[PDB]
Amino acid sequence: HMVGLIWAQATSGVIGRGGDIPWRLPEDQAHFREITMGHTIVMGRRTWDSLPAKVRPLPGRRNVVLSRQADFMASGAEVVGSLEEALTSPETWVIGGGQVYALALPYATRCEVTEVDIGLPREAGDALAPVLDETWRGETGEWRFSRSGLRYRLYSYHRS
């Protein structure tokens, strides 16, 4: 069972605020599909709730939602009460949010990280990216320009 994490962060490490992602990067959707299509995607229940009803579940992937709530209904997803329960297919991508990235990092051998060149200083209640330690290796891709007006770039990090 391989596990990867995929996220986008501002240079501050902020990934979420007010139940949403505080930028848009339409051009990076193809990369997100490329990585995740045909695989299991795992997300925390706050990330599931952040997806509009019309976009969820994400098509072409097995959607799994992590919650402690016995009852919890996430229609079009399988709800599980632990991360280890999700991790049963050959390839699983954790697609957010902050709590779940922190839970899943020990299990991961890939992180696909888009860095957005925005000064987005941290504020109370923000969701933050996990911190990568020295075990991680990988390169910094070249800058790309979004029509949203922001530069962004892709880190493909991996470890054994």
Ligand SMILES: NC(=O)C1=CN([C@@H]2O[C@H](COP(=O)(O)OP(=O)(O)OC[C@H]3O[C@@H](n4cnc5c(N)ncnc54)[C@H](OP(=O)(O)O)[C@@H]3O)[C@@H](O)[C@H]2O)C=CC1
């Ligand atoms: N790339 C990006 O920039 C991304 C940003 N985001 C953003 O991240 C934010 C959401 O992140 P965050 O608030 O950290 O929430 P999460 O999406 O990580 O969801 C947290 C919920 O997951 C469940 N959960 C957490 N830990 C466990 C556990 N150990 N066992 C079982 N269930 C667990 C809980 O559900 P419950 O309360 O039901 O028990 C918890 O409340 C939003 O702003 C979202 O837009 C999301 C995805 C990508």
